[PDB]
Write a protein that binds this ligand. Structure first.
Ligand code: MFU
Ligand code: MFU
Ligand code: MFU
Ligand code: MFU
Ligand code: MFU
Ligand code: MFU
Ligand code: MFU
Ligand code: MFU
Lengths: 351, 351, 351, 351
């Protein structure tokens, strides 16, 4: 059906020096951010810092090709705004600047392989729209342009190994649909094509170490399902497979430094669950639980030494995190620790 | 729930010279058999030949370690009987000889790695029972002995790569359960352990080319699901995965000569469907259909040159087959051809 | 150059019940054999038993498709003779029967996938010759027939996964050459083709679990080298790779029950060395040594529970063996133990 | 022995927008550079542009974590100097700035995973020395510090998947030696350890998509050899393997967008040769030749759409290039095309 599983409560990015930095919306409806002081999971965090301005979406973040983080959000009148570091690895930001338009989803940002950011969002006519940097890592943007379709989830964009951006979204029939650049980093796009099934979360996309994209989503029966490219184009995919175990949030996927995939999701008992590929391309482990009730989907990242780190909303409405203790992929994990200073709200547009 | 998907209509074996031979039950309630005259899929078949005697199960067949085929069936009073070739690759059979007992499933036969046949069946108390050759390829059998449990499907047995027989069956809770030799070819067995889930077919088991067993079955939502060993013991398995596509028979699995798995099943439109692993351990292709409505599950085998061949019941109640045209695993396939002479009935005990 | 590294001192086969049985030539110039009483590496051995008759080659053995072992040897006048078990798993043998011809290598036997044994040997004109069973597992043989070429090593034959026999031998230029059935189990053969390089041992061939043959041999610099099929035909192969470490015998290859390859050879210090694939298709481990000076190449086999076992000639001129302690492929190993009763000689024709 | 195979004639880097840029030494002994105008292999090139100043090494280049290219070279008095783009993707450079020291190899630069450049070179005492940025992408450098050893080749540095820099060099015994950070991006280093063998080129290092480093080098018999990590630490490696085919330059390695490795080297006939992995981890293809005699080792890079591109010195002493025609990894290749404007010299210090 048409449910959208609970989103992650923050977006995360690595800075130019790989320090992790998180962005979320507080009770004042402003975006706040916090960062590691050094790029290791046991680092202190700087503390929560506000960007002035009321917002009405989850903030999206990406690192420019010159190392500067840039954040995208929706304003009260549904326009898109963006902020950026004015130099890499520095806490001096531009404050919010306008890209106009009217959007009806969270904004989603991807980096073209020619160094230009590109933003995707659902529009007021429910089509997919996009806007892009016209020169790499420069505040020079295109006009808005439509890619059509009818969307019923937030979009997810990811670059193929050959540099073609590909965008995924739920359609009017609740199936997963996708559309792609047919030449890398150009405004030449395919038609929409359906990958069928029914999904009940936003899609989540990752690249494998054989150059094939893989998509994860919750399905109609509330279990995790996934599908992958089988060749070196966007057209031909595997069948869908679902894994046993009811999940109650969007999934978050990560490729560990051994090249194998891991997926995290809130489980049926409202704790964080993890599953991983036990061999090349499969199969998948039984889900393993971490202690503690959580109140959002996980958001996952990797530190400068490869260690996986996970962020979640706690029952105190604050952000908590845990991580791998060693770069070994069968390393033990820490238990939830607080990143205190503010509490957060779920501003995701499509919920 | 407690449905058991339609079974295959014949069992099949390779003779000592790899000629295929099929066994099924005709309208007279007798077992009839037919064989290739030469071990190639385009060979003529000898014609259907009767074993005298009324039976009340699907016949099971296995090749002894001396090359002689041996068939196991249930009689009207629920006892087990067996017949054998008196020399490899010859049509001179022993006629039915008694192993007594009382069984309430189809008999299932496996070959120990010390060359002794072993037969498994559900008993009159719904437990798993077994009986075995006490010397390899010899008509000298043990007494019947119980392995306990409560079974609600026919059993499926397969040997691990380390020589330990492992038996799979649906239990009273409709989950997949299993039990195993703890030392190869000995009467030292584990306790029953559940692999969970719910299955609505008999389980079907195959060995991968990394030494790991994999089990296929139809699930509660009538799609194919599968699970595999993740290590080099019987205890630790993957999570279950289900593949999209409703199936309407038991599946049949085969390892092609490139070492990759293929599964065949009757689909939702009552045609034969096939899916295959597109890479090592996964993922799986979309199902592909063959033309023609079929009236049983497929039974699958491989010829002396590796070519896959599939048998099914047609709407005329006769046996049909098709095969790969070349030893290439992306070879085209023939269309259904008749193996005429008799018509067949489904004598499977648990249906 | 034209050296041929020291051969194994026995051939070995698994009986129908998987008991290991070894064949070698004693100081009386007769073939003697010995066998496990039960199919486990720690089993007692029956004791050494003689086949009457003087021989002038290493004996070759293969199991027929009806489970009966059959041995091939050369007589004083260079004719081929064979002996067989008259029933599987029994010590009642036919005594030596004539196949005539004149051969100038050790005989090499392979089993076609239609159940017919086929023997290859160098002839008096240095070409490759062959002779075969005309019906599976029957004492009915063809006439001798030439496959041409010029051979400078003993031949090695192995069946492809699609049932085509392929034969390998060193040629007049000291390179590895090969020739193959172009249809499985038929007398339709390719032309000779060179795989180039230079080898200084007989070639040793094994099948991988993706259906590709791989060939091992000592090279000109006395290190192990190997080459593999890259597709699903006999024509297209990889480049050669050599592994560091000087070896002083023929290698012996085995596929462990995890599907990975291991190679054993006498090393530069005259001890047994082993190397194994640390991942799928590679790379290879550093050689690991077993304690004890040895006086032949290893001969390797697998027991009914998958455990690898190795046989060698000791400095006392008797046969010794060691094995894996568990079915785990990183299991510890036993130390050399004697299979006493006779001493052995190297009767290999081409040395 | 102590030969060092011919080096590449340029270094290459991707700009922040992925445009390729090459650096080499002309007949005036100055560094000149040239770049793609757009990041595609069929792009025009801007033309050759000079950095004023006489140099006495091959120039090394790396992209900072803020996207700015930075070049390292030796001056007449053997000191290290560096130049950088003052903004990403712009042709406004700092001109040469001093890092002093005295070096006796080409400088080699690597990027730590905390965004700090680090430079390695042989010193006047033949030990390995290093110097580093003390803050990411900032002109603030450490003092020089020794890592000891005795070097007889230029060093090669590469980051492990867990963020630890590892450095490779030939030692006084002509073997490959290595040393590594024991904590990522810290000045805590291991002792030197030997990987044995004998190499007759500089080592060339790449990371696989399972997180394992692999090293290529020419060996004593002038063939390509390679060795790889087998676990997730720096300590345990495979045996060495050599591939047939005599090579007459350093090799250049690249990971294609399907995750498989390819190696290029000048061959025995003075043409460019290529070999590639035909499966996961192996084996390797026979070498394939491109038409045309070449006068240096290849330098290899990848374009924004994944396409591989190769640079070489021609017999006219100018730079030529060729590339893949499509993002397919079995795509055809172009033939050599000139990047004209200057001629080049081999300034590599250790030759
Ligand atoms: C620029 O156009 C405005 O913004 C787009 C993103 C769409 O919502 C469109 O319907 C709207 O008119
Ligand atoms: C082009 O197709 C349109 O857009 C897709 C994204 C889907 O919503 C589909 O149902 C709709 O008709
Ligand atoms: C030998 O025992 C008989 O046969 C077994 C297979 C069981 O059905 C048992 O209950 C029955 O009494
Ligand atoms: C040992 O457990 C028993 O047998 C199994 C095969 C299952 O039927 C289970 O429900 C039952 O209690
Ligand atoms: C049957 O022919 C005889 O045996 C063959 C195996 C060859 O040695 C041939 O030269 C010889 O004449
Ligand atoms: C067909 O070629 C012949 O036989 C091969 C086996 C090689 O000995 C070769 O040198 C010889 O000319
Ligand atoms: C800073 O030290 C100088 O430069 C180093 C790189 C070494 O060559 C050293 O011997 C020399 O004295
Ligand atoms: C620490 O060891 C020293 O440095 C290495 C790099 C080698 O040159 C070795 O021969 C030398 O003794």
């Amino acid at each position: 059906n048409s449910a959208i599983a609970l989103s992650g409560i923050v977006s995360v990015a690595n800075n130019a020096d790989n320090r992790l930095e998180v962005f979320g919306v507080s009770t004042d409806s402003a975006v706040w951010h916090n960062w590691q002081t050094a790029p290791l999971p046991n680092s202190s965090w700087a503390g929560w810092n506000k960007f002035n301005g009321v917002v009405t979406s989850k903030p999206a973040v990406h690192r420019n090709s010159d190392g500067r983080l840039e954040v995208f959000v929706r304003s009260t009148d549904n326009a898109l705004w963006h902020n950026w570091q004015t130099a890499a690895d520095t806490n001096t930001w531009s404050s919010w600047q306008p890209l106009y338009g009217g959007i009806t989803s969270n904004p989603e940002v991807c980096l073209n392989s020619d160094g230009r950011l590109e933003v995707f969002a659902r529009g007021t006519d429910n089509a997919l729209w996009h806007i892009w940097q016209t020169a790499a890592h420069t505040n020079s943007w295109s006009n808005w342009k439509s890619l059509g379709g009818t969307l019923t989830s937030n979009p997810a964009a990811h670059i193929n190994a050959d540099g073609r951006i590909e965008v995924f979204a739920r359609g009017a029939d609740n199936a997963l649909w996708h559309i792609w650049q047919t030449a890398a980093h150009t405004d030449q796009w395919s038609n929409w094509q359906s990958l069928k099934s029914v999904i009940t979360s936003d899609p989540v996309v990752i690249g494998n170490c054989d150059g094939r994209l893989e998509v994860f989503a919750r399905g109609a029966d509330n279990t995790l399902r996934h599908i992958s490219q089988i060749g070196s184009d966007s057209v031909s995919w595997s069948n869908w497979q679902c894994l046993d175990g009811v999940i109650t949030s969007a999934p978050a996927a990560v490729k560990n430094i051994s090249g194998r995939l891991e997926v995290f999701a809130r489980g049926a008992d409202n704790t964080l669950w993890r599953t991983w590929q036990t061999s090349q391309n499969g199969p998948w482990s039984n889900w393993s639980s971490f202690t503690g009730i959580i109140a959002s989907a996980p958001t996952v990242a990797k530190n400068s030494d490869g260690r996986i780190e996970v962020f979640v909303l706690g029952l105190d409405k604050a952000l908590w995190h845990l991580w791998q203790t060693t770069s070994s992929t069968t390393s033990s994990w820490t238990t939830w620790a607080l990143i205190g200073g503010i509490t957060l709200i779920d501003a995701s547009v499509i919920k």
